[PDB]
Amino acid sequence: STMKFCRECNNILYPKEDKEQKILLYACRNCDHQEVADNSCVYRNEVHHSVSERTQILTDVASDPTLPRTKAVRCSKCQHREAVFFQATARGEEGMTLFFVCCNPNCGHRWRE
Amino acid sequence: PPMDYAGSRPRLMDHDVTLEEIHKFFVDYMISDTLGVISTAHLVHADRDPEKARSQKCLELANLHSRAVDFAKTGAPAEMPYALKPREFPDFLERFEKPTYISESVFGKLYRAVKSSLA
Amino acid sequence: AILGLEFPYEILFQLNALVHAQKISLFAASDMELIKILRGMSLETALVILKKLHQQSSICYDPVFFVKTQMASAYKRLTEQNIMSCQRAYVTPSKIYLLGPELETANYVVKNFAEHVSDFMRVTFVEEDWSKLPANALSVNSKEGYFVKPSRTNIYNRVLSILGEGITVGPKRFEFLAFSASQLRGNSVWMFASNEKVKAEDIREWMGCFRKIRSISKCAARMGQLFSASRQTLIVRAQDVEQIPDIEVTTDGADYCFSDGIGKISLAFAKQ
Ligand SMILES: [Zn+2]
Ligand SMILES: [Zn+2]
């Protein structure tokens, strides 16, 4: 995913490998010029999920799923059953611990397992 | 049948103790230390509501008391709810400032008998 | 720095306890004449007159006139009934109160460190009325943003600073060793004054290695569990110890263990 123009004729160069040279080289078919490569890099692409361009807004691809909700747990500050539970790591602890967030709009209370 | 004895999940750190988190835990022990009020609330609810130790409120209070006892072992706060406060105390207590209500349970009868014997 | 001499630590601690008590004011005991008189005398007579002054029913205004008008065993006590003189300190948000060398039952940690009897001090964090600290005085809740987040008060930072920096009394600086399970429920903690011979970390590593425990509460519990009153007995090496396997039963998907802390003993060991 990289390209450069040789100074001799200002044309694109294609990478190639030589067994005897054992070094990356760039030469073009337009003119006869071989130049030494830099950093030994022939491809560098950041992985992205922007494949369905101009299509993720109409059809809901569900890129960010919604957190599950449960009604078995009962809140402490208020007597509301609906709550949001998820797993996340602590500040310094290891593993996944279950958390809870109250769904009452007037409560705004969160507690651990 | 007895209640479940399974405790909370232990919390394990990724690094050794630097003598600071222990101080944080020691200071935070005072905060949210509701060990002494759960028993009083359970006694008040048992004296007020008939058929005590049968409703779900008593089970919740017992679970909270067990968690509070386990707080000294594992860092799991009791999280005492606000709506569970009794806001009323029977005769056989030293909370003179708090409102006092006449109890008609077995404890009330025993306290009345003791008062009559003393007088 | 005002004294700038070789004044003994015990007399200075007793004087501080007197000042903290409602007996003598700060300036009434900071004069040059009083320290000059109390510098060179008999130690036992000085302790006797100091405790007699402490036992005064009313407030003393002139200590100089009062003191003018007035005029080994620790190891045996520990081996007999575990009797030690432990200093007790009360830390309040406003000031600090020193009760003094009150007699109390000795624990295991002082059996092998009986020489530093005065280095051990009990520190309890109480309110101004010497009562328990209310929950509203530490980490008062406040609603900031979408969720409520507790806000630490200045008393929280003061307690943290006291625990970290330590308490300095005379030519000593006490350090945090550990706290027992009973002391955890009463907001009490042990403090040991560091010395050139044995320091707080030396005692901490002598008790055991606690880096294996990765739980904050479990590590503190294991470090403070070895502070209960006990009677000294003979010493047994680590050559004759059994490893009897235990029994475990798993029913209904629940782990039930019969042997939690049970053990086995012989008749000769019981007789000894
Ligand atoms: Zn070219
Ligand atoms: Zn709620």
DSSP run (H or E) holding B113? helix B106-118
Q: How many residues does chain B have?
A: 119
The 8-class DSSP code of residue B75 comes to -
Q: Distance between CA atoms of A17 and C129, rounded to whole angstroms?
A: 85
Tokens of B52: 């005590």
Which of C156, C159, C221 lies nearest to residue B73, judging by beta carbons?
Answer: C221
Asked whether the beta carbons of residue B73 and residue C217 sit closer than 8 angstroms, the reply is yes
The 8-class DSSP code of residue B43 comes to H
Asked whether the beta carbons of residue C133 and residue B35 sit closer than 8 angstroms, the reply is no
Tokens of C152: 């630490």
B30, B35, B67: best to mutate for the C interface, most C CBs within 10 A: B30
User: Which 3 state secondary structure label does DSSP give B46?
Assistant: helix
Q: Are C87 and C13 in contact (CB under 8 A)?
A: yes
Instruction: Provide the residue type at C146 as one letter.
Output: Y
Q: Distance between CA atoms of B13 and C211, rounded to whole angstroms?
A: 11
Q: Distance between CA atoms of C17 and C24, rounded to whole angstroms?
A: 10
Burial class (CB in 10 A: 0-12, 13-18, 19+), C172: buried
Helix axis angle, C43-54 to C9-20, nearest 10°: 10
CA torsion angle for C132, C138, C143, C148 (degrees, to 10)?
A: -90
Is the CB of residue A91 less than 8 Å away from at least one CB of chain B? no
DSSP bridge partners of A27: A14, A34
Strands C120-125 and C83-91: parallel
Is A103 annotated for ligand binding? no
Which of A77, A79, A93 lies nearest to residue B11, judging by beta carbons?
Answer: A93
DSSP bridge partners of A100: A85, A111
Q: Distance between CA atoms of C224 and C207, rounded to whole angstroms?
A: 10
Tokens of C97: 């109160």
Q: Distance between CA atoms of C116 and C120, rounded to whole angstroms?
A: 7
Tokens of C185: 């429920």
C216, C225, C256: best to mutate for the B interface, most B CBs within 10 A: C216
Q: Are C18 and C29 in contact (CB under 8 A)?
A: yes
Q: Which of C190, C220, C205, C13 lies closest to C107 in space, CA to CA?
A: C190
Burial class (CB in 10 A: 0-12, 13-18, 19+), B22: buried
Q: Distance between CA atoms of C118 and C12, rounded to whole angstroms?
A: 12
DSSP run (H or E) holding A17? strand A14-17
Q: Distance between CA atoms of C133 and B33, rounded to whole angstroms?
A: 11
Q: Which of C98, C97, C90 lies closest to C189 in space, CA to CA?
A: C90
CB-based contacts of B74, cutoff 8 Å, min separation 6: B7, B8, B10, B11, C215, C217, C218
Strands C248-251 and A69-70: unpaired
Q: Distance between CA atoms of C232 and C183, rounded to whole angstroms?
A: 23
Residues of B with Cβ-Cβ distance to A96 under 8 angstroms: none
Tokens of A111: 């507690």
Q: Are C102 and C88 in contact (CB under 8 A)?
A: yes
Q: How was this entry determined?
A: cryo-EM
In units of Å, what resolution does this entry have?
3.1
DSSP bridge partners of C105: C83
DSSP bridge partners of B93: none
Tokens 């003189």 sit at which residue? C85
Q: Distance between CA atoms of C94 and C106, rounded to whole angstroms?
A: 31
Is A28 annotated for ligand binding? yes
- Planar angle of CA A71, A77, A80, nearest 5 degrees: 25
- Planar angle of CA C166, C172, C178, nearest 5 degrees: 45
Listed in sequence order, the DSSP H helices in B31-105 are: 35-48, 56-70
Q: How distant is the Cα of A74 from the closest Cα of chain C, in angstroms? A: 18
- Planar angle of CA C180, C185, C191, nearest 5 degrees: 45
Q: Are C120 and C188 in contact (CB under 8 A)?
A: no
Tokens of C14: 């007793």
Is the CB of residue A108 less than 8 Å away from at least one CB of chain C? yes
- Phi and psi angles of residue B113, each rounded to the nearest 5 degrees, phi first: -65, -40
Strand order in the sheet with C83-91: C96-105, C83-91, C120-125, C188-193, C174-178
Is the CB of residue B94 less than 8 Å away from at least one CB of chain C? no
Q: Distance between CA atoms of B83 and A75, rounded to whole angstroms?
A: 11
Q: Which of C79, C85, C13 lies closest to C50 in space, CA to CA?
A: C13
Please spell the DSSP secondary structure of chain C, one letter per residue: --S-S---HHHHHHHHHHHHTTTS-TGGGSSHHHHHHHHSS-HHHHHHHHHHHHT-SS--S-HHHHHHHH--HHHHHHHHH-EEEEEEEEE-SS-EEEEEEEEEE--STTTTTGGGTTTEEEEEE--TTSSPPPGGGSSEEEE-SSSEEEE--HHHHHHHHHHHH--B-SS-BEEEEE--HHHHTTTEEEEEE--SS--HHHHHHHH---TT---HHHHHHHHHSTTS---------SSS-------EEEETTEEEES-SS-----HHHHH-
Distance from the CA of A4 to the center of ligand 1, in angstroms?
10
